[PDB]
Ligand binder design. Structure first.
Ligand SMILES: [Ca+2]
Lengths: 216, 209
């Protein structure tokens, strides 16, 4: 088989600036016809891969003039001119010279935008859920940058540990921020013992930690 | 215009056969093109599995070639993937494609002995200007759920977080939306949760507490 290699797992870029994504093939993709059989794909968060470039250098229909492909028989470059927020996702090269067709491992485009503080929100367990004997308390951090944040759960001012899970969205296609949920899980019995449930967020965009809380 | 849509069970037991259907709309599969199955493993690596061509001819990745069949039924404009003797290595998102240009939305297949389980959907109630509300979608298996808001009419300001597999072996996520806090009294907000593997749709109204 032909092995397709993308050396960088991700590449940083400031929006408006340019970026290059590189690919190598273990065998020349130039056929005996002058065409080089290398495709480029973008997979945006939540979507299927989409064709960008075909035959190494040919822009596919609807793809902006900002994307261009260049290269030799074995070493290829996708150049993105003036990167926009909408360009985030994973870029994959694929050879279509010989079956089996094979892909590079992909390169994520990370947009390095400006600092943005999270809007924090706290949600108590619903009454419907409390019936089943479990309480989920949710802390939401919306549209922040950079990705790093510290979320701390405090119950009756006693710092929690071991009893929460976080999830973070992919970089957003529109504003290049992240959002995060932290779900605190306790039994109903353990929930009813306490009064003040608080979520304390630490982040670079916050001159002081934001705490959101509720009384049971 | 031409569209491809995968269907199939989200769950297959270890050592059993996986069968997926690609339904092609607005195109005759006997007319032209090569019709591919491509899969994406957790961790995001892509593998081309094989095709059936317009003329019923086959080519399969030597990776699978003993276990794979790609067939078709032009009377329904569908082509099929069969993969025998699945292991945990076969857990992936399966895409059907027309050439490189037209891709289905993908179907997740999880290789597991466990049964399907539909989600519980709980409101995340707004506790101004704008406010966040949402739905906690808990205790389902396997992936995925899809979440829409007010039947597809509210799409601006929506975040549906990646699922996390809990210690119980069931998945959980939240979907949240940012909303005018003046419309909290008069506007109805319902999260539409679809869990295909269990054929369960849940509609939950999220009301201020
Ligand atoms: Ca693996």
């Amino acid at each position: 088989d032909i092995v397709m290699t993308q050396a960088a797992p991700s590449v940083p870029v400031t929006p408006g600036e340019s970026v290059s994504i590189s690919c190598r093939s273990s065998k020349s993709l130039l056929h005996s016809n002058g065409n080089t059989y290398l495709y480029w794909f973008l997979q945006r968060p939540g979507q299927s891969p989409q064709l960008l470039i075909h035959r190494m250098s040919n822009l596919a229909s609807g793809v902006p003039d900002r994307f261009s492909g260049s290269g030799s028989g074995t070493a290829f470059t996708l150049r993105i001119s003036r990167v926009e927020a909408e360009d985030v996702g994973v870029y994959y090269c694929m050879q279509h010279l010989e079956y089996p067709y094979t892909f590079g491992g992909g390169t994520r485009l990370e947009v390095k935008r400006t600092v943005a503080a999270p809007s924090v929100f706290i949600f108590p367990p619903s009454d419907e859920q409390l019936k089943s004997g479990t309480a989920s308390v949710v802390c939401l951090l919306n549209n922040f940058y950079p990705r790093e944040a510290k979320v701390q759960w405090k119950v009756d001012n006693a710092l929690q540990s071991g009893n929460s899970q976080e999830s973070v969205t992919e970089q957003d296609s529109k504003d290049s921020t992240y959002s995060l949920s932290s779900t605190l899980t306790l039994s109903k019995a353990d929930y009813e013992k306490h009064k003040v449930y608080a979520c304390e967020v630490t982040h670079q965009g916050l001159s002081s930690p934001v705490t959101k809380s509720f009384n049971r | 215009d031409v569209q491809l849509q995968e269907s199939g069970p989200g769950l297959v037991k270890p050592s059993q056969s996986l069968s997926l259907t690609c339904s092609v709309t607005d195109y005759s599969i006997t007319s032209g093109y090569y019709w591919n199955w491509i899969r994406q493993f957790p961790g995001n690596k892509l593998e081309w599995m094989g095709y059936i061509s317009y003329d019923g001819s086959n080519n399969y990745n030597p990776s699978l070639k003993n276990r794979i069949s790609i067939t078709r039924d032009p009377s329904k404009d569908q082509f099929f993937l069969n993969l025998n003797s699945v292991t945990t290595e076969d857990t992936a998102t399966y895409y059907c494609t027309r050439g490189s240009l037209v891709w289905g939305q993908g179907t997740l297949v999880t290789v597991s002995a466990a049964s399907t389980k539909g989600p519980s959907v709980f409101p995340l109630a707004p506790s101004g200007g704008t406010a966040a509300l949402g739905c906690l979608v808990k205790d389902y298996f396997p992936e995925p759920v899809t979440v829409s808001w007010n039947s597809g009419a509210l799409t601006s300001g929506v975040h549906t977080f990646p699922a996390v597999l809990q210690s119980s072996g069931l998945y959980s996520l939240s979907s949240v939306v940012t909303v005018p806090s003046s419309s909290l009294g008069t506007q109805t907000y319902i999260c539409n949760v679809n869990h295909k593997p269990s054929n369960t749709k849940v509609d939950k109204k999220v009301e201020p507490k």
